[PDB]
Amino acid sequence: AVTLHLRAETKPLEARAALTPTTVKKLIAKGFKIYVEDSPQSTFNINEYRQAGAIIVPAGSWKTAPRDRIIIGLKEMPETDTFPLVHEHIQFAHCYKDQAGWQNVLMRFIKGHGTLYDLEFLENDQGRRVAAFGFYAGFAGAALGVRDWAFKQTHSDDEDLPAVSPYPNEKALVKDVTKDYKEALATGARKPTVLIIGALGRSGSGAIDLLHKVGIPDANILKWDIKETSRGGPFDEIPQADIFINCIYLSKPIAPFTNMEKLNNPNRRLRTVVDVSADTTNPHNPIPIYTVATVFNKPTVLVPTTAGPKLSVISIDHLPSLLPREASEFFSHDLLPSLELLPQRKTAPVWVRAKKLFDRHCARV
Amino acid sequence: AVTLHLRAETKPLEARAALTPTTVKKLIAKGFKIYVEDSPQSTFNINEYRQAGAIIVPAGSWKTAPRDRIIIGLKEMPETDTFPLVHEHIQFAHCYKDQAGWQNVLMRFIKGHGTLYDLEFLENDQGRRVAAFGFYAGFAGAALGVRDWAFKQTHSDDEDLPAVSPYPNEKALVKDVTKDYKEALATGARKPTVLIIGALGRSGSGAIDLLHKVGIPDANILKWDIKETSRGGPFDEIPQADIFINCIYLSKPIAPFTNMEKLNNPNRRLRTVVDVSADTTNPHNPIPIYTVATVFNKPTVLVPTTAGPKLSVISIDHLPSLLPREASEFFSHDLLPSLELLPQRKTAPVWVRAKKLFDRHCARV
Ligand SMILES: NC(=O)c1ccc[n+]([C@@H]2O[C@H](COP(=O)([O-])OP(=O)(O)OC[C@H]3O[C@@H](n4cnc5c(N)ncnc54)[C@H](O)[C@@H]3O)[C@@H](O)[C@H]2O)c1
Numbered sequence: 248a249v250t251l252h253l254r255a256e257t258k259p260l261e262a263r264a265a266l267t268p269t270t271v272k273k274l275i276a277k278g279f280k281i282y283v284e285d286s287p288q289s290t291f292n293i294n295e296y297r298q299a300g301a302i303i304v305p306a307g308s309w310k311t312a313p314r315d316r317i318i319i320g321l322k323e324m325p326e327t328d329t330f331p332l333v334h335e336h337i338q339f340a341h342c343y344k345d346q347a348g349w350q351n352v353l354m355r356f357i358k359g360h361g362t363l364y365d366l367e368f369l370e371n372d373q374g375r376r377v378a379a380f381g382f383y384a385g386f387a388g389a390a391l392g393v394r395d396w397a398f399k400q401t402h403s404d405d406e407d408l409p410a411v412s413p414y415p416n417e418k419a420l421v422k423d424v425t426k427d428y429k430e431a432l433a434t435g436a437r438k439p440t441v442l443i444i445g446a447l448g449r450s451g452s453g454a455i456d457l458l459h460k461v462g463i464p465d466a467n468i469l470k471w472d473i474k475e476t477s478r479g480g481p482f483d484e485i486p487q488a489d490i491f492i493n494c495i496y497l498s499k500p501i502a503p504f505t506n507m508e509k510l511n512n513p514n515r516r517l518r519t520v521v522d523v524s525a526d527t528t529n530p531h532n533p534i535p536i537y538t539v540a541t542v543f544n545k546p547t548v549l550v551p552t553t554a555g556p557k558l559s560v561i562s563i564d565h566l567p568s569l570l571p572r573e574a575s576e577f578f579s580h581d582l583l584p585s586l587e588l589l590p591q592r593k594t595a596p597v598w599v600r601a602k603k604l605f606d607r608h609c610a611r612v
Numbered sequence: 613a614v615t616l617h618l619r620a621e622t623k624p625l626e627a628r629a630a631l632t633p634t635t636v637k638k639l640i641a642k643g644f645k646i647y648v649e650d651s652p653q654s655t656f657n658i659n660e661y662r663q664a665g666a667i668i669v670p671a672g673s674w675k676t677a678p679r680d681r682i683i684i685g686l687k688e689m690p691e692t693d694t695f696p697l698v699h700e701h702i703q704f705a706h707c708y709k710d711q712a713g714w715q716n717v718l719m720r721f722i723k724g725h726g727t728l729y730d731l732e733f734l735e736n737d738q739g740r741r742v743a744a745f746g747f748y749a750g751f752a753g754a755a756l757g758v759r760d761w762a763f764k765q766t767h768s769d770d771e772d773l774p775a776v777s778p779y780p781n782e783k784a785l786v787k788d789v790t791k792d793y794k795e796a797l798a799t800g801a802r803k804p805t806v807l808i809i810g811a812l813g814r815s816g817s818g819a820i821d822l823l824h825k826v827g828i829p830d831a832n833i834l835k836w837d838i839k840e841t842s843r844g845g846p847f848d849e850i851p852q853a854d855i856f857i858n859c860i861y862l863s864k865p866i867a868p869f870t871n872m873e874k875l876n877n878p879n880r881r882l883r884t885v886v887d888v889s890a891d892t893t894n895p896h897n898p899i900p901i902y903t904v905a906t907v908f909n910k911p912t913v914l915v916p917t918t919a920g921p922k923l924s925v926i927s928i929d930h931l932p933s934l935l936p937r938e939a940s941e942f943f944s945h946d947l948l949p950s951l952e953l954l955p956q957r958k959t960a961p962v963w964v965r966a967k968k969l970f971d972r973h974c975a976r977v
């Protein structure tokens with residue numbers, strides 16, 4: 248009879264939810280009791296949770312909720328808040344990797360006799376995260392990649408892709424990319440060849456998924472993972488592709504995929520780099536041709552080349568925000584097996600690892 | 613505007629389908645035209661396919677269907693069919709690994725100018741299968757493993773687990789297993805510990821799923837993969853578990869996981885071994901404790917031991933046939949993205965690889 252209480256998000260702009268109406272309903276089928284906070288920034292209507300069996304409660308009511316409820320939320324809590332945290336919480340606390348005030352954070356739990364299970368460290372036994380936002384970052388990344396290539400075909404070099412905003416569902420995004428894509432083809436541009444390094448992961452998968460839905464031929468989509476890069480870069484297949492999408496979780500050092508001298512070639516076809524990895528400050532960044540982390544309001548940045556057509560990078564570090572409903576559905580569904588195991592949290596190693604990680608980190612203050 | 617024609621299976625006791633009413637409905641929405649044969653032996657009611665929007669046609673219609681329709685089936689043609697095969701066919705034809713009659717099968721295509729796209733060699737660019745039957749193999753294996761362990765609590769050593777028969781659905785199989793599991797716990801047996809090697813793969817995840825659905829604590833389920841076995845065998849944890857489920861894909865020699873010397877021990881708790889891999893014939897076999905390939909009517913074989921309690925092996929090589937419905941849903945769902953590229957089969961690499969494989973084996977006659 249586990250009880251869960253979905254905290255409304257307070258980080259501004261944040262529209263994703265850690266439980267969606269669909270998983271709330273699955274959870275109720277399993278005998279969970281579920282409270283959901285009314286949150287007007289959430290991309291899900293409160294009515295959808297109500298049809299699903301949720302008990303609707305006011306925003307912020309977690310604070311005064313009985314200490315049997317598990318508080319589940321997605322992003323970290325207000326800085327303004329300094330009161331002791333008494334419940335077990337599930338959330339991204341962003342305090343395990345020395346982000347300043349991480350001690351304040353843990354202090355509030357220590358003083359409350361409260362527990363943090365950190366979404367970011369829910370792993371299976373082999374070290375893979377159970378729930379991440381990969382797919383839709385890759386999906387959204389690819390989609391702006393296409394809109395950027397398309398914009399370069401229909402507008403002069405001195406206009407940049409304008410400021411982009413989130414979409415209420417996937418079908419609305421695909422229609423808009425599709426429209427821009429068809430406009431590009433009317434100018435006589437060749438359909439893009441799109442190179443994806445790291446294609447077998449979550450984001451690679453989403454990228455590929457977007458491209459199909461948009462209508463780029465399958466043979467136009469090159470799908471590289473470990474074995475295709477193993478010789479080491481730079482790779483000639485990068486300047487030659489129209490769009491290059493870097494998905495990939497960087498760990499090892501690794502040689503660069505491409506560099507300024509290979510890209511300064513008047514035979515270069517590459518219009519658009521979409522760095523889903525966005526490991527820009529890393530000293531082994533496989534694509535060191537840019538520095539700016541782009542954002543929604545300014546989604547692309549020029550790569551100053553001496554030769555070839557105008558080349559731009561997308562390096563948004565918050566891509567799944569483009570599609571909050573779908574990023575929330577896939578993530579909640581990724582999380583749900585482990586949620587089903589909350590009645591066993593005191594012995595299930597997914598939950599025990601996360602409690603021990605918490606223990607290890609409190610010992611550090 | 614592809615047309616697909618779902619052929620009725622003729623292989624004795626084959627109840628699965630390559631397309632389910634559910635993927636038919638998704639394919640129709642992408643603008644495919646789908647005809648479904650009305651099947652005596654299929655686990656789906658023809659109404660389900662009719663209400664998904666298939667056109668219903670008699671058994672055997674594919675034989676004279678126009679050559680615009682792609683004929684999709686699951687298993688092999690009757691050995692006794694000799695007429696020329698004129699269509700594009702998608703199925704498991706089993707003639708690429710030199711099975712007796714492989715030329716005869718190919719000859720039927722050569723005489724007819726047909727084309728085989730073999731379901732078994734449908735793979736991505738990194739050489740991994742797009743669609744296999746792993747999950748419900750592991751799920752059905754685990755059910756049978758838990759049901760054997762339990763039988764050994766409630767019955768005597770001279771009795772073996774009774775013959776099993778396909779189930780109409782998951783819930784039914786789960787209700788049986790749960791009941792037998794509940795009775796076994798009344799005898800004061802310890803909740804079993806189940807070790808799964810190959811846990812991360814398709815069959816591993818199926819095995820984990822069943823175990824959860826029957827209420828085996830997550831902490832009792834030891835989920836091992838490539839990392840956990842690198843030190844190499846034998847492994848002391850195998851004799852110490854109640855149940856061991858081998859879900860590995862075996863691709864090179866590796867030291868055995870266990871052996872009779874280690875099994876021949878007063879202290880051993882291991883009661884039931886489920887070899888889902890069922891690589892009995894292979895020299896690399898990592899559990900060579902048994903020689904017999906068990907079957908539904910006789911699903912365990914005795915392992916003779918000189919010490920410890922009664923031990924059995926389950927080595928059924930057609931586990932997915934016990935849940936033909938679910939097995940079909942999961943297969944058809946995995947194959948679905950590939951079926952969506954059929955308009956592009958002449959250039960989509962996944963299909964071009966299969967056409968290429970076919971032209972290679974044809975040249976061989
Ligand atoms: N920009 C964003 O908004 C955003 C959002 C979420 C995640 N991410 C980031 O995206 C990256 C990947 O996410 P993911 O979930 O898809 O990881 P993932 O593990 O699922 O995929 C990583 C893939 O890249 C492959 N790979 C690793 N190194 C490689 C190399 N040298 N050459 C070729 N292939 C290689 C891996 O084998 C794997 O298939 C991570 O850095 C993640 O933090 C970014």
Ligand SMILES: NC(=O)c1ccc[n+]([C@@H]2O[C@H](COP(=O)([O-])OP(=O)(O)OC[C@H]3O[C@@H](n4cnc5c(N)ncnc54)[C@H](O)[C@@H]3O)[C@@H](O)[C@H]2O)c1
Nearest residue numbers: 746749810812813814815837838841860861888929930931
């Ligand atoms: N018995 C049946 O009815 C039936 C039906 C389908 C498949 N299978 C068999 O199932 C086996 C696996 O099927 P799958 O779809 O789960 O394969 P899979 O590739 O999806 O997963 C195989 C897993 O084994 C792991 N692994 C490989 N070698 C290992 C080792 N030495 N130690 C530990 N882990 C190892 C891999 O990392 C992978 O996670 C295959 O041999 C297939 O032939 C049997």
Ligand SMILES: [Cl-]
Nearest residue numbers: 436437438439
């Ligand atoms: Cl073209």
